[PDB]
Design a protein around this nucleic acid. Structure first.
Ligand code: NA
Ligand code: NA
Length: 327
DNA sequence: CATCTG
DNA sequence: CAGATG
């Protein structure tokens, strides 16, 4: 956690580069397990040879740790932090919808700046385009102050379209977080579940509303279960307008809501730990359900849920208010 | 994993 | 359809 810091860190720096720059999924994938092992590792690695003793630990990595161990730097890391090429990938990518693959094509085409981009808006799909139009707005965090206004807006709409909808904004928002990255709504409807053969309108009808009232400013992708798009709180008495934000709406069968809703609430930690205990208690969990675990190794059969409360009970647990769902 | 691109 | 993004 702090003893093999630099090492894991350098490892991680490297891994990253293999994947983003190099297409180097393998290598990339390699730095990752090593970085992972030295991490758990209780000792203060004092050498490569020492480290190498580790699984995941090859010679190559041992060699780099050595150099690092020796010098507060690494040349290869040093070479990378310069390469306008390497740099231009990291940068581009930041653009929503720009992935690494693209980050390369773009560079090779000589597009390396945000300017480079606008310049060639033509060669960018709608996602990318929206992604560049609100580059600024998208990096900005989301104050809970705005969150609640946001929430309140959504909820008031959906209720309006159907008394029967059940929306829930998950996330850290949900956990108490003072600020958030994007808006995440969990969607449901009684009339829709596991077997229940569809109802697309179920997701659209709402997407529609939001635009009706203009909250949803743009669409990124919209499927019949998951929508990816833009929102914005109306600017008051003109002087201070909001920035644009990312939001996501998604249809969930009424029969695996709480499991999703529990799930998406995080934190990641609270999840596994919940899960690991869920395991003890003779159960299993995933994003969708809780299944009584056989002894034969495994088994299933979706235990019925009607709140995140049902789940706690199942695995016999202390119902946690989302707040403390930290770890 | 669900959507988009081409 | 593969392949890419989130
Ligand atoms: Na990106
Ligand atoms: Na392939």
């Amino acid at each position: 956690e702090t003893l093999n810091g630099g090492i894991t860190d350098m490892l991680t720096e490297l891994a990253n580069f293999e994947k983003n720059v190099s297409q180097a999924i393998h290598k990339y994938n390699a730095y990752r397990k090593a970085a992972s092992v030295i991490a758990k590792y209780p000792h203060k690695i004092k050498s490569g040879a020492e480290a190498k003793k580790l699984p995941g630990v090859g010679t190559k990595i041992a060699e780099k740790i050595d150099e690092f161990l020796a010098t507060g730097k690494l040349r290869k890391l040093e070479k990378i932090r310069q390469d306008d090429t390497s740099s231009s990938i990291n940068f581009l990518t930041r653009v929503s919808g720009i992935g690494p693959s693209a980050a390369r094509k773009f560079v090779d085409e000589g597009i390396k700046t945000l300017e480079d981009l606008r310049k060639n808006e033509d060669k960018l799909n709608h996602h990318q385009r929206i992604g560049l139009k609100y580059f600024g707005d998208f990096e900005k965090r989301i104050p809970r102050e705005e969150m609640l206004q946001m929430q309140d807006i959504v909820l008031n709409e959906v209720k309006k379209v159907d008394s029967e909808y059940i929306a829930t904004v998950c996330g850290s928002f949900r956990r108490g977080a003072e600020s958030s990255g994007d808006m995440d709504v969990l969607l449901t409807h009684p009339s829709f579940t596991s077997e229940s053969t569809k109802q697309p309108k179920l997701l659209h009808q709402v997407v529609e509303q939001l635009q009706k009232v203009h909250f949803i400013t743009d669409t990124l992708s919209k499927g019949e279960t998951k929508f990816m798009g833009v929102c914005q709180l109306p600017s008051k008495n003109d002087e201070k307008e909001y920035p644009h934000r990312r939001i996501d709406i998604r249809l969930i069968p009424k029969d695996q809501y709480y499991c999703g809703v529990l799930y998406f609430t995080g934190s990641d930690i609270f999840n596994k730990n919940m899960r690991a205990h869920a395991l003890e208690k003779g159960f299993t969990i995933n994003e969708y359900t809780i299944r009584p675990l056989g002894v034969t190794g495994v088994a299933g059969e979706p235990l019925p849920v009607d709140s995140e409360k049902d789940i706690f009970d199942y695995i016999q647990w202390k119902y946690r208010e989302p707040k403390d769902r930290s770890e």
